Structures are given as structure tokens and as C-alpha cells.
Design an enzyme around this catalytic site. Structure first.
Site, PDB file in Angstrom:
ATOM      1  N   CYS A 853      69.640  58.740  13.934  1.00 55.68           N
ATOM      2  CA  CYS A 853      70.797  59.458  13.609  1.00 55.68           C
ATOM      3  C   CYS A 853      71.294  58.879  12.022  1.00 55.68           C
ATOM      4  O   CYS A 853      72.092  59.736  11.540  1.00 55.68           O
ATOM      5  CB  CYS A 853      71.786  58.598  14.400  1.00 55.68           C
ATOM      6  SG  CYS A 853      73.649  59.585  14.415  1.00 55.68           S
ATOM      7  N   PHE A 854      70.660  57.830  11.880  1.00 53.70           N
ATOM      8  CA  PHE A 854      71.150  57.365  10.433  1.00 53.70           C
ATOM      9  C   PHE A 854      69.927  56.986   9.518  1.00 53.70           C
ATOM     10  O   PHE A 854      69.912  56.434   8.353  1.00 53.70           O
ATOM     11  CB  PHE A 854      72.062  55.891  10.332  1.00 53.70           C
ATOM     12  CG  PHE A 854      72.777  56.020  11.563  1.00 53.70           C
ATOM     13  CD1 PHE A 854      73.859  56.829  11.818  1.00 53.70           C
ATOM     14  CD2 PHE A 854      72.769  55.252  12.523  1.00 53.70           C
ATOM     15  CE1 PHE A 854      74.739  56.917  12.800  1.00 53.70           C
ATOM     16  CE2 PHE A 854      73.366  55.203  13.671  1.00 53.70           C
ATOM     17  CZ  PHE A 854      74.400  55.903  13.827  1.00 53.70           C
TER      18      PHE A 854
END
EC number: 2.3.2.26
Length: 886
Positions: A853-854
């Protein structure tokens, strides 16, 4: 009213015999067995008084019309009991029997075979041929001085003078070997071609030895003679005889069950400990070839069908293996030392390597023993009658633990040596031996442990039992086992066939090669199914072109497409561009059958309302079978689908980490629901809000989804189902045809072997990475680039191969590929990010994690390069219960 005996009809009602015990026969043994009773009880009716009427000479109806063989069997024999009578007297047999001392090539021996067969049909000659053969085999071939004795006892009887004289000399080239060879060839020919010799051999004859009483034990004495057990040709025929004389001996006992006249009338032989040990000894003979082994296995099974044999066989096998396993422990230990001190240039002492290469070694003997146990407890048992728990017990009494541990120690040395003879294949019969100990095991849910980390390199399998030896061993010797399969890839179609049950161990490249040849290469001769697409219409121009064509012919027929978009059908980049960009149009948002994954636009996804597409069913089935064609045929159709998609493509339960890159805030809340912030503070009813164009009906996920509430207790199940729905039931049925199109192309049973990232790197061309770009397009959180663990963490990156590193990239980048420019375009969920190595101490010695996600990553400070390496490898490879699930 009637019972058929080889095809005839007799009213058994007016007959003594009970058919219930005869019907069990395959209508073949019935013929002769019936005839035996027919003639014996007919003689009883002739001589013995006080007979009942059921027999009644078994009627003239069943003498004149009964198959002529039986008729002659009774009538002609009755006419000849006291015109097709014996052709030659007894002394003729002796004169004829001297042929065996006339050592000759083949061809010339055939005449003897048909003549001897024709000499049958005469209880006088048949009972004389057999006795003479047994006489030669049991009292003549031992010394070449006893050969002369029997030869004078034979020639002398040919002249009628059974008095011995003239000291007749042998041709001086006749050897007990040649007499045995000829006699056994003839005996086998008779037993095979003609019946009624089997029953003579098994049945008692009444002139405690058991030899003069039972002919069969004359052949059992051949199994303890170094003259016979040192020739692979006499053993072959001597076993082909017993494979027939034993099969019948088994069938009779089984059929009888109740009324067992044969057991009470022929007195079916009784086998003691020593007799079965003689048979078992064959598998331990240096002359036991593959053929002799199969025949011996059949004999063992047949004898096992008898009473009081199974236990005897098992005990003897256990004792044999225990005796063997002491030498293997010593032979391996010497090797383990030698291989550790071979340095460079030198080679293993050939004497120590000769105990592992010769076809009469112990490792082959252990393999044969274990294969025999498997045969015994597997052969015709239906997979449910198998007492695999009992089977394991046998393998546990062998105390082979030391041998397995010695093997593991031996193998470890090869992995860590620079040797010419390294060639672990010399222990291949020993490795396969371990794969018979585990082939019938359960080996299920013992793999499902994970979490464990770098606890190997000292494991002793001395008492790991049989259910806990497969995985610990294969996992340990993954590299060696993969290097052995890369040279002889046929090991997976044989000895290593059991490795299919631990796909985690098989590296990608071997997995791919095994996959293709098994599946793809099988289908060739593919016809032509061209289609003419436009370079912009592409997707529709192809789909609508066929749009309903046979799912088989399409893949089994070459696609020679002559597309109008440009000029060209194949041979120059025209056909592969078709494959290359076709799925690029399947993702086309206009169709709305896919979604740039909420995380990344580069990555696509079926779309929660993928069926919302006016044409979805025939637009996903297309996608499905399209992948299958390319995967089967070749090339790539680069996409990123999603980790659950691959899991769904492999029909496996999905994780929550998926939500991390599927709906960040949703995961931050769903994770917040499971943990982080949940004390019933989240509250809210259970089930998942079911969007209908904004109309949330929050369908009852489970029967009572709304019925239940999201409480601290039910938080876990609620989130599990929400993620499951948001990941699977969000697209629920629409993927089904997507699965049928693919699964029809590539069958599931040859996709289950792959897993997640492997399947992706298959579907999408394996990427390549630049370490330097992983030094600037990066971020070092709470960690110096050369602090301590980060440095040799980079060393670990270096030591990984392409397949491993791609996973490492895919363990931080979600679902693979490089965003070009050297990672600089780190396409996070927002669309821009940077690789982030978050220290996240969190039990600094435990397994790592990440959040694509990051473009994130967790590095628990370990201490050791080896431990870090192991944890990293486990994590990146791991797809279930580690990185997967929770």
C-alpha cells in the site's frame, strides 16, 4: 438352475458340487477344478458303494454334451483308466528326458516343447514328466558329480534297466547350469501353456520333508542354491513358475471360505516361517533384476492372500531392513567424512563409492524392501482400506531414523563441496527410499505451520517418525533436490513424483519446465483457427469473431490470424503483439469489466461490479481462456490482477493484507476492527454494506450477517467476511466464467502446483532489478544503509537469484514488475511513493513483513546474516498463514 463352467450348462441342482464357491472363480479355474471333482467322484461312484442320486454319473447329458475335453477328461480317461492311450512307455520318457543333457541353442528346443506338451493328456506320462524334472532339479544339479549320478539313473532307466551300470560319462560340456537352464525352460513352457500341471505341483501326492509329499517344495529348495541364485535367467523362469503356481494357490483359499474341500481334499500346502523367508530372500539377491522383482512381488502378494502369511512377511521384512540399515549407517558415515575432505582434484575412494553405485548395493536392497511393504499394504486396497497408520508403524520399527539423519548429513556435504563425484544421484535409491516411507502418508496440515525460522542445519531425524520426516527433510535439502531435478527432470515422473505434494520446495524454473512438458507438449498437431482483428478494434474484433467457438479446438488449433490492423500473420512480431496487447483491451474501462486497482492504476482488477458491463459473461470467459492460450502457447499478457485473484485462480483462502493495497482506509478500519482500536468502539452491525448504486442493503454476509453485530468478540469473523466479500464476493460469480475459460485451457490439477507470485511470474515475464536503483529510489527508516543488518541484508539481496528477488520486489511492490526509470516512479496507492524500509523492531528476531500500500517494508533487526536470509526467504516465498491470511 444351471451354473456355467467355462461356458457350458449343467443343472447343478442335480449335482453334488456347490457353485457359490465356484462362481468366485473367473469362469476359467472353474473348468479344470470341476473336472477334478467330476472324475474323482465318478471313480467314487464306480468303486465306493452307497452313493446318492444327485451325482447320477453327472448325467449322460453332461457327458455327451459337456465340452469334449471334459468328456475325454472323464470318458476317454475312463476308457483309458484301466485309443489315444499313452504314446510311449515309461522308459521312453527317460530316453526322451536325456535331451536336457544335449546342450543346444534355441529353436532346436522348441520341438521338445510341443512334443512334451503333446505327451500330456496322460496321467501316466504327466505324473512321470514332472517327477523326472523335479528329480533332476533337486538331486542332480549340485556338484556336476551328482549330475552324472542322475544321468546314469536316467539313461539306465531309458534302457529299462533301473540297475545302474556302464558309468556313462557326460558330454563333458554339460554343466549343472545347462541342465538347469533347459529343464526350467521346458518346465515353464509346460506350466504356462498347459494347465493340470499347476494342480499337480501344489497338490499333495503321498509318494517331515514335505518334498516327497508336496512337489512344490522341490522348487523352494532351488532358492537356497548358490548355483541358481547366481543366475538372472534361471531366477526369472523359476519365479515365473511360482507366480502361476502361487496365484492359483491363493484363489482356491479365498473362494472356499466356507466349504473348503480343496483345502480338506488336496490339502492346500501350509507355509512356515522359513519357507516365506526363502521367497523374501530373492529380493535381497544380487541377481534380482527389475523383472525378477515384479514377479517376486506378485508371488509375495499371492502368498499374503493366504492365512498366517501377512504378519510373517511383515516381520521378516522388518528384520531384513533392520539388518541392512546398520551397514548403510556405516557406509554413509564414511562417505560423509570422505566428501568433507575431498578438497579439489581428489575423488572418493572408489571402494567406498562402489557400495553406493553397484546394482547389488544395500541402498537398492532397502528400496526393494520398502517397495515390497508398499506393495503389500497398497496393492488392491482401494485407498480407504489402507491402514496407513499401521503401515507407518512398520516403518517406525526399522529404527531408520539414524539412516535418514546420516543421509541428511551426507547430502548437506554435497551441497557444500567442490567435488567431481559429488553427483548425489549415487544416493538417489536412498532418497527414493525415503519417498516410499512417506508416499502413503497423510502429509497434510504439517506444512501449514510457517512462523518457524532457520531451525535446520542440525536436525536429527533419529526419532522424527514417518509423518514428520518428509517436509523437514525436503525443506532442508531444497537446493540439492532442485539441482538433481534440473539435470534429470524425469525424476518428477518417477522417484521424485512424491515431491508434487510439497510444491513449496520445487523452485520456479523446475516448476515451469515440469508444467509445460506434462501439459503443453502433450498436445500438438494443432489445426489452424485464424481470426482477422484490427489493431485498434483488437479485443472485440477477436472475441466477436469467434465469440462462441469450441473451447477445445480454439486452444488445440494454431491461431494463424491474418489481422487487418497491419500486414502479417506470424513470423516477425505480428502474432505475439496480438497476444501481447489483447488483454490490454480486455481491461478497457469502456467495457468496464476491469478496474485499475484502487491502489495502482498500472494494476488492473476485475472490478467489484465487473458484471456491470453490458457484455461481461462472454467478456470474462474470453479473458480466462485467452490467458490459457498464451500461458500454454507462449509469451505474456502483462497485468497485475491482484494477489487474491491468483489465489482464487488457485482456489485458496485469501488474506487480509490484500485489503492493505485494496482499500487502504478500509484496511486501516478493518485492521482497526480486528485490533489496534477495537473495544466495541467500532460497533456497527455485522455483514458488509452491499452497495447498489449507492443503496447499501448490507446483505447478510453469513445467514445472519446483519443479525450479528461487529463486537469485540465477533470483530475477527466480521472483518474476515468483509475482506472475503470485498475480495471475492464483490466479484463473486462473474469470475466463475473467468475460471472456466482458464481452467478449461489449463486444468486446475496442473495449476495447483504453482502458487501466487510463481503464477504471476509465469503469466507475466519474469522481471529484472537493479540493486543500485534500489539504493537511491529508496528510503532508510531508523536504519543506516550500513548500520549492521541493512548491509548484509543487501548482501542477501545479492545472493538471491532472479526468481527469489522478483518475489522480494513482489513482497514490497504487491504484485511484481518494475515501474520503469529505475523504481523512481514508485506507483503507490496514491500513485506516487518510495520504497520504505520501516525498522518496526517488533520482536526484532521475528519474521519480516511489508505494506505495498505504501511500498513499505518491515525489517526486524535480527543480528545474523543467516537468520535474516532465512526469514526473508521464508517471508517472500510464503503465501499462506504468513504473508497470507493474517
Amino acid at each position: 438352475v444351471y451354473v456355467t463352467i467355462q461356458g457350458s450348462e449343467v443343472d447343478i441342482g442335480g449335482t453334488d458340487i456347490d457353485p457359490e464357491f465356484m462362481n468366485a472363480l473367473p469362469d476359467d479355474i472353474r473348468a479344470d477344478v470341476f473336472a477334478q471333482h467330476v472324475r474323482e467322484r465318478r471313480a467314487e461312484a464306480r468303486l465306493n458303494s452307497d452313493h446318492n442320486v444327485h451325482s447320477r454319473e453327472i448325467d449322460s447329458d453332461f457327458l455327451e454334451a459337456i465340452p469334449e475335453d471334459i468328456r475325454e477328461g472323464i470318458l476317454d480317461t475312463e476308457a483309458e483308466e484301466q485309443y489315444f492311450a499313452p504314446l510311449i512307455d515309461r522308459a521312453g520318457i527317460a530316453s526322451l528326458m536325456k535331451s536336457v543333457f544335449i546342450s543346444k541353442p534355441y529353436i532346436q528346443r522348441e520341438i521338445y516343447h510341443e512334443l512334451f506338451y503333446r505327451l500330456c493328456s496322460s496321467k501316466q506320462n504327466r505324473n512321470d514328466l514332472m517327477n523326472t524334472f523335479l528329480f533332476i532339479l533337486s538331486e542332480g544339479i549340485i556338484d556336476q558329480h551328482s549330475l552324472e549320478k542322475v544321468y546314469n539313473i536316467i539313461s539306465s532307466r531309458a534302457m529299462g534297466h533301473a540297475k545302474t551300470t556302464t558309468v556313462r560319462q557326460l558330454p563333458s560340456d554339460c554343466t549343472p547350469l545347462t541342465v538347469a537352464n533347459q529343464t526350467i525352460e521346458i518346465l515353464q513352457s509346460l506350466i504356462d501353456a498347459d494347465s493340470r500341471l499347476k494342480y499337480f505341483l501344489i497338490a499333495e501326492h503321498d509318494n517331515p520333508d514335505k518334498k516327497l509329499r508336496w512337489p512344490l517344495w522341490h522348487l523352494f529348495s532351488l532358492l537356497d542354491r548358490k548355483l541358481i541364485t547366481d543366475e538372472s535367467v534361471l531366477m526369472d523362469l523359476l519365479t515365473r513358475i511360482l507366480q502361476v503356481c502361487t496365484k492359483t494357490l491363493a484363489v482356491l483359499s479365498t473362494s472356499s471360505n466356507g466349504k473348503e474341500n480343496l483345502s480338506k481334499k488336496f490339502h492346500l500346502p501350509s507355509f512356515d516361517e522359513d519357507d516365506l523367508m526363502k521367497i523374501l530372500s530373492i529380493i535381497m539377491l544380487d541377481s534380482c533384476t527389475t523383472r525378477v522383482f515384479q514377479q517376486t512381488l506378485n508371488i509375495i502378494y499371492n502368498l499374503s492372500k493366504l492365512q498366517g502369511c501377512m504378519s510373517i512377511f511383515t516381520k521378516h521384512l522388518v528384520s531384513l531392513a533392520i539388518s541392512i540399515m546398520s551397514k548403510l549407517k556405516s557406509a554413509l558415515d564414511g562417505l560423509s567424512r570422505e566428501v568433507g575432505t575431498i578438497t579439489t582434484g581428489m575423488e572418493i575412494n572408489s571402494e567406498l563409492l562402489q557400495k553406493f553405485t553397484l546394482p547389488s548395493s544395500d541402498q537398492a536392497k532397502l528400496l526393494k524392501i520398502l517397495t515390497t511393504v508398499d506393495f503389500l499394504y497398497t496393492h488392491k486396497r482401494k485407498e480407504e482400506e489402507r491402514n496407513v497408520k499401521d503401515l507407518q508403524s512398520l516403518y517406525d520399527k526399522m529404527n531408520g531414523g539414524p539412516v535418514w539423519s546420516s543421509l541428511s548429513e551426507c547430502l548437506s556435504q554435497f551441497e557444500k563441496s567442490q567435488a567431481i563425484n559429488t553427483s548425489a544421484t549415487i544416493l538417489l535409491p536412498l532418497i527414493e527410499s525415503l519417498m516410499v516411507v512417506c508416499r502413503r502418508s497423510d502429509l497434510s496440515q504439517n506444512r501449514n505451520t510457517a512462523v518457524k525460522y532457520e531451525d535446520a542445519k542440525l536436525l536429527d531425524f533419529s526419532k522424527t517418525r514417518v509423518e514428520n520426516l518428509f517436509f523437514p527433510f525436503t525443506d532442508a535439502h531444497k537446493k540439492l533436490l532442485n539441482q538433481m531435478i534440473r539435470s534429470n527432470p524425469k525424476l518428477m515422473s518417477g522417484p521424485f513424483a512424491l515431491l508434487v505434494k510439497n510444491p513449496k520446495v520445487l523452485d520456479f524454473d523446475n516448476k515451469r519446465y515440469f508444467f509445460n512438458a506434462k501439459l503443453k507438449s502433450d498436445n500438438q498437431e494443432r489445426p489452424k483457427l485464424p481470426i482477422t482483428v484490427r489493431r485498434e478494434q483488437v479485443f472485440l474484433d477477436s472475441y466477436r469473431a469467434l465469440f462462441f467457438k469450441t473451447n477445445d479446438e480454439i486452444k488445440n488449433s494454431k491461431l494463424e490470424i491474418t489481422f487487418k490492423g497491419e500486414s502479417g500473420v506470424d513470423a516477425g512480431g505480428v502474432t505475439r503483439e496480438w497476444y501481447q496487447v489483447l488483454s490490454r483491451q480486455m481491461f478497457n474501462p469502456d467495457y468496464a469489466l476491469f478496474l485499475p486497482v484502487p491502489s495502482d492504476k498500472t494494476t488492473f482488477h476485475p472490478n467489484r461490479t465487473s458484471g456491470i458491463n453490458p457484455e461481461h459473461l462472454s467478456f470474462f470467459k474470453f479473458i480466462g481462456m485467452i490467458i490459457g492460450k498464451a500461458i500454454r502457447d507462449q509469451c505474456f499478457l502483462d497485468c497485475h490482477f491482484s494477489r487474491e485473484v491468483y489465489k482464487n485462480i488457485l482456489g485458496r483462502p485469501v488474506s487480509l493484507k490484500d485489503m492493505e493495497s485494496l482499500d487502504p482506509d478500509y484496511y486501516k478500519s478493518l485492521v482497526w476492527i480486528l485490533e489496534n482500536d477495537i473495544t466495541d468502539i467500532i460497533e456497527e452491525t455485522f455483514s458488509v454494506e452491499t452497495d447498489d448504486y449507492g443503496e447499501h442493503k448490507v446483505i447478510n454476509l453469513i445467514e445472519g450477517g446483519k443479525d450479528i453485530i461487529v463486537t469485540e468478540a465477533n470483530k475477527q469473523d466480521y472483518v474476515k467476511k468483509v475482506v472475503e466479500y470485498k475480495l471475492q464476493t464483490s466479484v463473486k460469480e462473474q469470475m466463475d466464467n473467468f475460471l472456466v475459460g482458464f481452467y478449461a485451457l489449463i486444468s486446475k490439477d496442473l495449476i495447483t502446483i504453482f502458487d501466487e507470485q510463481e503464477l504471476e511470474l509465469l503469466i507475466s515475464g519474469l522481471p529484472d532489478i537493479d540493486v543500485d536503483d534500489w539504493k537511491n529510489n529508496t528510503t532508510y527508516v531508523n536504519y543506516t544503509a550500513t548500520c549492521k543488518e541493512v548491509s548484509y541484508f543487501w548482501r542477501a539481496v545479492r545472493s538471491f537469484d532472479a526468481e527469489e528477488r522478483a518475489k522480494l520486489l513482489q513482497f514490497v511492490t504487491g504484485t511484481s514488475k518494475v515501474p520503469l526509470n529505475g523504481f523512481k516512479e514508485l506507483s503507490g496507492v496514491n500513485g506516487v511513493c518510495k520504497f520504505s524500509i520501516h525498522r518496526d523492531f517488533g520482536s526484532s528476531e521475528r519474521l519480516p513483513s511489508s505494506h505495498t500500500c505504501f511500498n513499505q517494508l518491515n525489517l526486524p533487526p535480527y543480528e545474523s546474516y543467516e537468520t535474516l536470509r532465512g526469514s526473508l526467504l521464508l517471508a517472500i516465498n510464503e503465501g499462506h498463514e504468513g504473508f497470507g491470511l493474517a
